[PDB]
Amino acid sequence: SATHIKFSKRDEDGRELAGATMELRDSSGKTISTWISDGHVKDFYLYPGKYTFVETAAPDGYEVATPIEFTVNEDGQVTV
Amino acid sequence: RGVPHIVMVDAYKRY
């Protein structure tokens, strides 16, 4: 079954940041979702697997972050 | 409760 996670794109001051072009990819290279961050946390439901959050572009004035890999385990545990 | 929070930080460009 699927596991609930939340993704937050923030600035250096701990505040949610709008305007980043984001994607979520699985270990086989399939794109699960693409979106533009909107200044709020974004929920996902994901089946077990290895995934990567990848920033395609940052809002004007910000640096692109390194991708974040994580694993959703068979039992709902998520490891970063 | 207990939903994992995955946080990606966008640093400022020097300008």
Side-chain angles (χ1 to χ4, degrees), chain A residues 1-29 31-49 51-73 75-80, chain B residues 1-13 15:
Chain A
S1 73
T3 296
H4 190 182
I5 68 141
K6 282 176 180 180
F7 172 76
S8 270
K9 187 72 178 67
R10 290 190 191 139
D11 66 15
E12 274 170 39
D13 317 342
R15 303 172 295 204
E16 294 284 332
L17 175 62
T21 305
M22 293 300 306
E23 55 212 316
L24 176 62
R25 295 172 59 94
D26 68 22
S27 35
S28 49
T31 299
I32 299 313
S33 188
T34 70
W35 68 100
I36 311 298
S37 68
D38 71 346
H40 292 279
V41 72
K42 186 166 181 57
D43 301 73
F44 296 88
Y45 270 92
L46 298 175
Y47 278 87
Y51 298 92
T52 311
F53 283 110
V54 179
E55 184 172 20
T56 292
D60 286 350
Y62 297 83
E63 301 182 349
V64 177
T66 304
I68 300 174
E69 158 91 32
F70 66 102
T71 298
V72 182
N73 296 108
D75 64 312
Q77 158 93 7
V78 182
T79 304
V80 195
Chain B
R1 171 210 227 281
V3 174
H5 300 172
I6 300 176
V7 178
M8 179 180 278
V9 177
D10 283 240
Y12 295 111
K13 296 168 93 186
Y15 62 90

